[PDB]
């Protein structure tokens, strides 16, 4: 751990503190996640073991590269690649000028590629929010902070603890669904996509009910036709006000017809109908970015 020189503190979490650092010899600029072990009565935190393990498997250009794990005197250091800015800081800087549509499109496609990779490896991110999405100076964006990522196979159960910032939480979760699905990550990305276009949070609630009411105000209060099973859900109330769906011209005005289409498919109430990351990559909105491949009919 002597080859690193701390440049500055980036942030802090329950688990550990993040620093920008230089490998003094090489000049490699890295991000160090320091984890004090002497503070934890249960050894290496469950969450840190899972993040290290998951990130060794997830090797994709649109996922943060974990470069090394170093064990020091009651300290565990995760060494990651450094990225100069997160999407939250980038969007705030671009609030007046706007983000150019080709850059919005490039970022969304890249986010969808990294997410499809996680989903194909049977992993749920569960915490997709702008400050967990890191960008570099040459147009790349990567998914980061896999502290809350859980693998499925035997679906991940829901609980009453600090999970995904309410603002990006899917409606099935707010309505009491007992199991998370890959659809919750697609819901977060639709929120982030709308936020890149408008430069303001699509659904900024202050409680679980305020969040749900904000979703219903924009997308319309759902029913059995749009979402088979919604009325029979644990936290659904027949007393919910019946708002109608707003036109996507008034919700995301700068977006084109292809853009409005993808966003509606990403924000579909039904987790079974909501587009997948793989299917989203095929959407006509990215036809200028990607070129389709021949499908083997066999």
């Amino acid at each position: 751990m002597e080859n690193f020189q701390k440049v500055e503190k980036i942030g802090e979490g329950t688990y550990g503190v993040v620093y920008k650092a230089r490998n003094k010899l090489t000049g490699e600029v890295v991000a160090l996640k320091k984890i004090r072990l002497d503070t934890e009565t249960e050894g290496v935190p469950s969450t840190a073991i899972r993040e290290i393990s998951l990130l060794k498997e997830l090797n994709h250009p649109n996922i943060v590269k974990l470069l090394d794990v170093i064990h020091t005197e009651n300290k565990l250091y995760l060494v990651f690649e450094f990225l100069h800015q997160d999407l939250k800081k980038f969007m705030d800087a671009s609030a007046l000028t706007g983000i150019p549509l080709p850059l919005i499109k490039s970022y969304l496609f890249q986010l969808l590629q990294g997410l499809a990779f996680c989903h194909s490896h049977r992993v749920l991110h569960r915490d997709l929010k702008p400050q967990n999405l890191l960008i570099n100076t040459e147009g790349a964006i990567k998914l980061a902070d896999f502290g809350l990522a859980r693998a499925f196979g035997v679906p991940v159960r829901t609980y009453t603890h600090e999970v995904v910032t309410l603002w990006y939480r899917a409606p099935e979760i707010l309505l009491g669904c007992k199991y998370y699905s890959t659809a919750v990550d697609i819901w977060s990305l639709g929120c982030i996509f709308a936020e890149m276009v408008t430069r303001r949070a699509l659904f900024p609630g202050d409680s679980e009910i305020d969040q749900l009411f904000r979703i219903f105000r924009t997308l319309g209060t759902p029913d059995e036709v749009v979402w088979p099973g919604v009325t029979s859900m644990p936290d659904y109330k027949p007393s919910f006000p019946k708002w109608a769906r707003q036109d996507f011209s008034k919700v995301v005005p700068p977006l084109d017809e292809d853009g409005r289409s993808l966003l509606s498919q990403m924000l579909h109430y039904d987790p079974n109908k909501r587009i997948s990351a793989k299917a989203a990559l095929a959407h006509p909105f990215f036809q200028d970015v990607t070129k389709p491949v021949p499908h083997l009919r066999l």
Binding site: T41, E42, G43, V44, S46, I49, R50, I52, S53, L54, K56, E57, V69, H71, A116, H119, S120, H121, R122, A151, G153, V154, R157, Y159, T182, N272, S276, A277, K278, A279
Partner: protein, 266 residues
Amino acid sequence: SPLPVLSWANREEVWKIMLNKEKTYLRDQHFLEQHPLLQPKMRAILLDWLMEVCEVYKLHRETFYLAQDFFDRYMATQENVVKTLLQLIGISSLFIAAKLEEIYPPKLHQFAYVTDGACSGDEILTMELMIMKALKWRLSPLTIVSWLNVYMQVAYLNQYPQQIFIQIAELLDLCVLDVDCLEFPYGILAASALYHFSSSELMQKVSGYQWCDIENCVKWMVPFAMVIRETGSSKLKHFRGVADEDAHNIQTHRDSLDLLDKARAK
């Protein structure tokens, strides 16, 4: 590729990624040739004990199989291990597994408690670090039981019935106690166990493996399946605080030691 057209990702892409994981995660049926002081019956008593403490703390079958794989893979990196050191390595492998798989896992003092004082919290926190570092932090394998779950999901997507699952799991728990199982890939072991309770046709429909792929494994498995058959398979139990839909996923314990004696005899 027995998985149907998956909505989330390509049916074949998910399946190929699962197969490529087995190719990267390696296990050796002769790892005890590196620890001459140890005999294969020692590993059997250890895994049987871990299985019982799992049932006691109502821990998931995935938790048990994570600890089994961590223990077997860790010892492949080690040499000249002593009989006394085995209790600590197994319970620390289980400590890591519980923290990874369970939502509210048992506390470190409960893991020390089951060793009747022969292991303390500091010994387990020291050992978990040695295990994780030696395993190169590769603690996300596809267990023997995970394949069984995938095979049951495929057979019923074309959730699933619990009673049948625990009967096949019961046979895999017996086979896992013999270190020779580590010669067959984890997916092969699960398909072979499922075949003993079904047919080659169903095995190929849910695992994509042909008869030639699992024939060698089914031959080795044959004695274990007979001991399970001779006595009759167990029934699904209820666990306090455990939601009935997840009851088949709770690790159970049997008199498997004497069943393992009868199996190796024939």
